[PDB]
Amino acid sequence: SIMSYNGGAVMAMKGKNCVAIAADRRFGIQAQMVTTDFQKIFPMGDRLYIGLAGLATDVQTVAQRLKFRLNLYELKEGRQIKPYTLMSMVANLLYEKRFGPYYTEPVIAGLDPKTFKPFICSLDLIGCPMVTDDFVVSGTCTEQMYGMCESLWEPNMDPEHLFETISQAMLNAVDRDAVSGMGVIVHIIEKDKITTRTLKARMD
Amino acid sequence: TTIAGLVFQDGVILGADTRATNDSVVADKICEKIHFIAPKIYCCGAGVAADAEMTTRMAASNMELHALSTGRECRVATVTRMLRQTLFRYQGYVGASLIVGGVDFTGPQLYSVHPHGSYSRLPFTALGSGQDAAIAVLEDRFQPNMTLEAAQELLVEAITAGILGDLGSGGNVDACVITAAGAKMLRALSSPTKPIERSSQYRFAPGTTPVLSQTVVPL
Amino acid sequence: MEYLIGIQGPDYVLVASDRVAASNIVQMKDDHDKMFKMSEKILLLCVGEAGDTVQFAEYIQKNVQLYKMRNGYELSPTAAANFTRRNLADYLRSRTPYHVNLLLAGYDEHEGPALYYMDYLAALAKAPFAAHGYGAFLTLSILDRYYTPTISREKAVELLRKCLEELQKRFILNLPTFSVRIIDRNGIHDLDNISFP
Amino acid sequence: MEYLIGIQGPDYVLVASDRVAASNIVQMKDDHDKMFKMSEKILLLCVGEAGDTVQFAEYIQKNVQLYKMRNGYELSPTAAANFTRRNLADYLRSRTPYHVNLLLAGYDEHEGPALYYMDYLAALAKAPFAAHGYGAFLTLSILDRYYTPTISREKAVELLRKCLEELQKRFILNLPTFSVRIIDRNGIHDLDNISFPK
C-alpha cells in the first residue's frame, strides 16, 4: 500500500543497563532508488532517540511536528523528558489526525533519566502506544525483523552483547528486504556515554 | 481479543487477556487492557486499539471531574452514556468496543457498549473476536447470585475458553475484583500455558561485527 | 516527459535540462527555458504536469525573493530546499495537488556546492547527482561508473554530453536541444547550448 | 506510433517508412525493416500493434506467394489489395482482432502505378498518396500543396525529404532513420537511407 512506497526498517532492542536502536540508510521510490545517506533516526535530546519509517513525506513531516512539541516541552519544563512521556506525545499527534492520519510507525527508545533504567516503545498508524520488555521494530519487513530479535534477545545484556546482537539482527533481516539495505546506522545509548557506529553492509 | 465480565452476589469481576496483535503478528504478550475510571468503576476496551484507548482516556477524564465536582460516588450508567454519545457524534467512525462494569450505591452493575453505540444492561457478556467462546461458557454455567469463589472459578475458565478458542486471544489472564467493600486488582491471576522456556541460548563474542565507522561522544 | 539532470563537482554544480515543450503529438516550443533563477548562486529545475510546472515554480521563485529582500540576504542552499518541501507538502492534501519534480542547485561560501533531489511527494534527499523523467534510467547509470568527488568540470561536461547523447539513441522522444549551465564561486556561467545539426 | 508514407508518380510509386522499433521508454531497434516484399513490383508497408504488425503481415506475405506459385504469375496490385482486405475483415469479428495499417505499393504493365490505403477496419480506398500514424497529419498537408500527376521522381524525393524533416521538428518522437524505395518498370530500386548526423 502506501507504507510500501518508501519501505524502510527501524529496530530498537533493550539491554541490561543500556538500549540500542538501529535503522538502515536506504531511501528509494518503488523500483527507483534515490540516495544512500537517508537518516531514519533523529535526536530527541540526551539519551532519547526516535525511529521513523514508512512514507518519507510523513517521516520528515512528523519529525518536525515532534520537534515542534519537543522543544516547546523542553523550554517550558526545567527538566528533560522521560521516554515514557514522549510515547504518549506521539499518540496525541497521530490521533488528532484520525480522519487524515499520517503514515508512519514511530519507534521510541532511550533510558529513564531517573537512574539507569532503559525504556522502549513503538506505535502504529492508528497511534496506539505499546510498551514491550524486549524489543520494538517497525517497517515493511517487520515480519522479518521479529524472528531475529525473538531468539537472540536475552533478559540482560551488556553493551558488548547488545551491540553484537542488534547488529547481526539488522544485517541478516535487512538483506531479505528488497526496499531496505544500503548500510545500517546503529546507536548505543549508555548511562555514561553514547556510541554511534556505521556498519559495513552490502550494496544491494 | 477476548474480554468478559460476570456479576455475582457480592460484586463483579471483569476478566481480560494480556495479548495484543497487529493483523499478522502478536504486538505484545503482556499488554494490559482493563483501564481505570473510578475506584469502584472499571472498563476494558476492544476492537480498534487506539480508538478504545483514547475513548477510555476521555471517559476516565470526564468521570474524574464528575467525581471531583460531585464529591460522591460515580454511577456506572453515567459512563455508558458518555461513551455512546461520542460514538454517535462520529456516526460509528470510532471502532471502539467497550464493556463497563462496577459497583455503585445501587449495587453491582455490568453494561455493554457496541462500537455503533448501542447499550445493553446484562449480568454477563463478552466482547471482542473471542466473545463467542466466553459467552457460551458463561451462558451454560451461570447461576443467580453466585458465591465470590464460585464466580471466580467460572470466569477464569471463561477467559481460558475465550483464549484457547481464539487466535487473537492469548497470554495471561488479568481479573479485577470489585466489591461493595472495595476493589482489588489481580495481575496475571491465571497462566494456563506452562512452556515459557527454550531449548537453546544465543550469545555473541566481541569482535564478530563488521564495524566500519566508529566514534565516541562523552556525556 | 521532460528530463532533468545535475552533477555536484568539488567546487561546482553542473546541471542540464531539456528545452522542448510539447503538447499532443507536436513539439510547440523547442527553445523553452526550464531553468528558473532563485538567487545569485542558486538555480532551480522544475518539471512535471504542464500546468503545475510553471505555476508552482513561480511561487517558489518569489517566496525565495521574499526572504532575500526582507533580511537583506538570500536563503542558503540547504535552507532553500527545506522551505520548498513544506510548500509542496502543504498542498499535497489540498484540493489542488501539484505534480512536480525539482532539482535545487546552489553554492555556499562554507559548505560549498549542494545538489538536492525532490519528488512530487515532497521527499527531500541530498545526493551528489540526481535526475528526473524516464530518461533518468538511461543516464544516472553512466554517472555511477564515471563519478568521483575529485572530477574536473572539463571532464564532467564531456561526460554530461555522453549521457545526453544517450537520449538521442535509446530514449524515444527527440529532445533536440539541451540547456547547460554551471554554478561556482564566480556565479552563474552559461555553457554552449547543445545542438544537433 | 510508427509512420508510413507513399506517393504515386506517373510511372512510379515512391514509398517511405520509419526504421525505428521501440518498446517502453527506449528504442530497441532503430534499423528495423518495416518493408515487406509481396512480389517483384509489389511491396507492402505494415504498421500497427507490435504483435499484430509482424504476425499478420507475414500471413499476407505467403498468401500472395501462394497465388504466384499456383498459377505461375503474381497477383496484380488491384487483386492483391482486395484479397488482403478480406483477410483482415475475416478476423475482425473473431476473438483475435488485428490492429494494423497497411499501404500497398505496386506497378502494373497496363494500369501502371497503384497506391492503396487500408485502415484497421479493412476499408480499401485507392488514393494518389496516403500516410499512417500521427505523423500523417503533419505530412499529407504538404502533399496537398505540391502534388501533381506530372511530377518527376527527382522532385518527389526532394519533396519527400521536406515532409520527413517535419517529423524531426514538430513531431515529437525522434525517428532518426527512414527507409526509402521506389517502384517502376525496372523493378525495386533502393534509395539512400535518410540519415541525420545529429
Add this chain to the structure above:
Amino acid sequence: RFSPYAFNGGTVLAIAGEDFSIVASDTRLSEGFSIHTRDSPKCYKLTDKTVIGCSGFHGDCLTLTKIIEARLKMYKHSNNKAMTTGAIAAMLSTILYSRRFFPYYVYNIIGGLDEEGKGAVYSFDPVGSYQRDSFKAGGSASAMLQPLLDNQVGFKNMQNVEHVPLSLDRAMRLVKDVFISAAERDVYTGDALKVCIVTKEGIRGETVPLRKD
C-alpha cells in the same frame, strides 16, 4: 459472489544438511480468525528419501497432493524405481503450469536426499518456478524463518569465525527454537510441532510441544 481462495496460514521449513535433510511444519489449521483443529499435519511422505510440505489454501493442498501421489505410481510402475528428489520437483513444475490460467494457490516445499546422499531443498511458487537451495521456508511466517537461518545455518554477515558444516544435533535445536520463536509472534503457528528427519538410514519423526495460544 464466490471466493475461490482463502488464506489458511501455517509455516513450513526445510534445511539440507551434509548427510541429512530435515523438514518440519506445524499442526495448526485455521481459516480466518477461527481454529478448525490443533492437529492437522501438513507434512506428507512421498518416498522414503523425499518429504513434501504444503502451505497455502487447504483445499488445493489436499487435491494437489493426491495428484502427485497418483503420478508417483505412474512413474514407479513404468520405471521400476522410486523418483529422485530432483525428479519430483521438476515434475510438479509442469503440474502447476497445466493450471497456468487458473493456478493452484499453494506454496510447496520439497526436501530430501539425492543420489549423492546430499540434502536437496526445493521451494516452489503457484506458477511453478523452482530452484535448489540449502534451506528454504514458506507460509505465513516465511518472512520470519529466513533471516534466522541466514545467520545460523548460512554463517552470513559474520567476519572471522569458524565455519563448521551443519550438524544434525544443532540442526534439530535450530529448527525447534525458530518455531518456538515463531509460535510467539505468529498467530498461525503453534499448538504442536512435527519434525521429519530424512537420513541415509531412514526417516525419523519427532514431536515437540508448543504454546497453545
Add this chain to the structure above:
Amino acid sequence: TQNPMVTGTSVLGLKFEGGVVIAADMLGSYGSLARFRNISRIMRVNNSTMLGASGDYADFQYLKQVLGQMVIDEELLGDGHSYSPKAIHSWLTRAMYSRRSKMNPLWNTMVIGGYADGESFLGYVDMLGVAYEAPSLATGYGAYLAQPLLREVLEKQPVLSQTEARELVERCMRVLYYRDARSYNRFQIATVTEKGVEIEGPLSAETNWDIAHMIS
C-alpha cells in the same frame, strides 16, 4: 453460484466413547423469514454412518439424490462392503471441489459422523473444500459458540459416555438457541452406535429466562 435461497442453520457433532451424536435444527430459512419449521436435516447412510449439513437445503436435497442413490446402489450390489465414514467424507470433498472448477459451486456445509469397528469418526467438509478430522465439530456460529464448549470438556475428559454426550449436546443446543437468531427451538438428536443410527424425533430444551428479572 447465482442465487440459492433456501438457507439452513447450524449443525453440531461430537465424539464420545463408542458412538457419535449429531444434532441440528429442523427449521428452513428463506431470507429473514422462518418458513418451513418441519424438516429432516439428518440423513442416515447405511447402518454405521450418518450425515448432516447446512447452507442451501435445496442443494442438500440434490446431494440426497446423488449420494443416496450411490449408497443404495451399493446395497443393491450386495458385495458385502459398506462405505466407510472416511469414504463418504472423502467423496464429498472431491464432489464439492469439482463444482468450483466449473464455476458452479453449491452452497452447503456438511458434517460426516460415524462409528465402525470401534473407530469413532467425525469429519468436516465445506463448499470451499476445506476438510479435516476433529473430535468435536460445528457449523455456522456453532464453531464460534458450541465448539469451545466441547473443547473444554475433551481436554478435561477425553472419554465421554453416551449419557454425558447427550447432556452436553442439549446444553449446547440450549446455548445455540439463545445466541443464534436464525436457530430454532425444535431439533433432532441423532446418535450412531454399535446398534447403528438411531434418530430421535422432535425435541426441545428447558430455557432459563431469569435474566429478564436480573436485568430489570
Add this chain to the structure above:
Amino acid sequence: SYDRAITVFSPDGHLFQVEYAQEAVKKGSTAVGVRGKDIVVLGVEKKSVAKLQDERTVRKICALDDNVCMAFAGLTADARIVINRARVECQSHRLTVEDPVTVEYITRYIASLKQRYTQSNGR
C-alpha cells in the same frame, strides 16, 4: 464419412495397391535430370502436338522455389495436388526459417505425404 483400411498386407507382405501405383508410374512419359557442377538440367519429351494442343498448359517442369525446381512422370492429375501442397509447405518453411529451403528438407515434406495417404484410412 468413409472410414476403412484401403492398403492391406498380403501373404508375402507385398502391397498390391502400392505395386499397381508404381505400374502407373512406369507408363508415364519419359523425364530425366542430371546434376552438373554449378548447374542442373531437366528435360521431358512431349510428342503429342498436331498443332492443336497449346504448349502453355502442357509443361511438366515445375519450380517449387527460386532455388528448387522439379519434374514429374505419372498421372498428371495427382501431380497437380502434390506440387501445390509442396509449394504451400515449402513457403511455410520460409515462414519458420528465414534461410531458404534445402532440397532435402522439402523432399521429406513430400515423400511423407505419399507415406500418410498410402496408409491413411479411405485414402
Add this chain to the structure above:
Amino acid sequence: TTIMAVEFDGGVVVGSDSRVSAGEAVVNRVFDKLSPLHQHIYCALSGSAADAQAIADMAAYQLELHGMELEEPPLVLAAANVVRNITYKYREDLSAHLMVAGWDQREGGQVYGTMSGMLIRQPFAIGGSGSTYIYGYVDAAYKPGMSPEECRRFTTNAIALAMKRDGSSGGVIYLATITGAGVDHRVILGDELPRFYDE
C-alpha cells in the same frame, strides 16, 4: 424486531419482544424496547437500535419540557408529532422508526405510527421487521369492543406469532397496559407463550 399496540375502551395494550440482534448474532436476548417518554406516554422502539435510542432521549427531552410548562400530561398527539418532525427532518442521518402510543384525559388511549416520517391514527398498529408477516391474524381476528382480557390475548397471540416467523424477533413478550388509573407492566416467560399449530 416486533412492536404492537391495540386500542380498546379503557386504554391501550402496547407489546414488544426482548430480542435485540445486530446482524445475525444476538447482542442481548433480553431488552426492553419500550422507553417511557412520560407517565402514560410510551414509545415502542424499532428500526435501527442506535438511532431509536437517540431519538427516544431527544423526544423525552422535549416532552418533559412541554409537560412541565403545562403542568399536565401532554396529549398523545403532542408526543407523536415530536417523534415525527425529528424523524422527517433528520431522516437523512436517522433510519429509525418508532410507534407512539399512550393515554390522555382527552380522547383516552391512542396509538400513532410515526414510521417513515408520516403520522396517522389507527385502532391497532404494528411495526418492525416482524410485523409484515402478522397482517393475516391482526386483520381477521380483530373484533370491535373487546374486553381488556381479550385485548391482552389478541396482542400476545400476534406478537407470539411474529416471534415464530420473524428470525430477528424472540425472547420474552413485554406487555404494558396503559389506562386512566395507571400502567401495568407484565412479562410473559417462554413457557407462557401461546402455543399455535406446531407443524
Add this chain to the structure above:
Amino acid sequence: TTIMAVEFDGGVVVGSDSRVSAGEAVVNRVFDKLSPLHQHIYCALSGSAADAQAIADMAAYQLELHGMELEEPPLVLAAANVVRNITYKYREDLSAHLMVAGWDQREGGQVYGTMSGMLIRQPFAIGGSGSTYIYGYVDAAYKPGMSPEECRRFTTNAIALAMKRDGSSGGVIYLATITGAGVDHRVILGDELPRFYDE
C-alpha cells in the same frame, strides 16, 4: 400474485387470484393461474409469468407421457418432482416458482411446494408475492379436521386478505376443489369477497 392450497379429508382446495400485472400496470385483470397438468393434477403459477407458463407446458409434456405409459393418473409426488428438477436445473435462466397440488388414489389430496427448487409436503401451502402477509391468518385460524365448507371459507378468507394487502394481487378468486369424484371450479365475484375490518 397469491396462490393457496389447503389439504383436508376428502381432497384439497387450491385457490388463486385473477390479477396479472407486469410492473405497476395490469396486463390482464382476469387470468387463470391454475394450469391443469392432468385431470386431478393442477399447478398454481407464481413468480415470473413468462417462465411459469413455459414450465407448465414442459411439465405437462412429461406428465402426459408418464400418465399414458402407466395408463393411470400419476401420483402427486410424481408431478411435484417434475417441476422441481426443471426448476432446480434451469434455475439459472428460470426464476419462476410453482406450487403442485392434486389428488391421487394412494394418499389422497396432496400439496407440494416446489418454490426455490426444493420439495416438501405441507397440510396447507401458500406462495406468491402476497403470501408473505397472510402468515398470521393461516397459522392461527387453521384447525384440524375442517369440513369441505370450512376449507372453502378458510382458503377464501386468506386469499381475500392477501388481495387487500398485496398490491400485485386482485381480481376475482378462483377456487378448485379436487376430490376423488372430480374437480369443481368456482369463481368468486368482487361482491362475494368476504368483508373484513374496513378501518
Add this chain to the structure above:
Amino acid sequence: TTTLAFKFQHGVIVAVDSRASAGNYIATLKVNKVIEINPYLLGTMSGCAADCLYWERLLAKECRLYYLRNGERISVSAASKLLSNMMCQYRGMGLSMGSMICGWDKKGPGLYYVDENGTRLSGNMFSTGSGNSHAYGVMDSGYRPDLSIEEAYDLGRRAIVHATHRDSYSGGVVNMYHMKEDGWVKVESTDVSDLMHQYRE
C-alpha cells in the same frame, strides 16, 4: 531483474543478476536466470520465471529435435523465429515472457530478442528486465565492435554492478557468460557488493 547481451568481434557476452523478488520480500538471491539450451546456444529469462522455464525448454526441445532430424545445428535465426511463433497463438491469455537468444552460426554471433507479444528484433546490443534502461546507459558508453576479450569483460562487469545498484528488483551475484565459436563458457561469478567495494576505492 536485469539481463543484457551484446555482440562484438570476439562474440557475444551475456550478463545477468541473480536476484528475483516477489513483492517486498526477496524470494531467492541465488536464482540462476541464464537458461542453458545447447552447448553453443544460450538463452535468458525476463518477466515471469515460470513462463521462461516452460517455453525456453520447448525451444530447447525444438532445437534438439532439429539436430536429431537434419543434423544441421540449427541457426540462431531459426530458433528466435520458432520461439516468437509459439507466443503468438496464446497472445491475450496473460502469458508474459521476455528472453534473449545468443549464439554463433555460419553468419556470425547473432543476437535476437523475443517479447511477450511476439516482437522479434535483431541488433548489436540488447537488454531486458526491470533494469534494462539502467543497463543501456553503461553499455552504450565506451562500446565498439572492436573491443577485445579483456576490455569487454570490464564493460559487462560494470554493466550489471552499476545497474543493479539503482534497482530494487536487481541484485545478487553477477553471472557473465562469454560466447565463442565452439560454444559459450562461464567466465566469472562474483557478488555485486564485493565489486562495489572495489569501485568506491
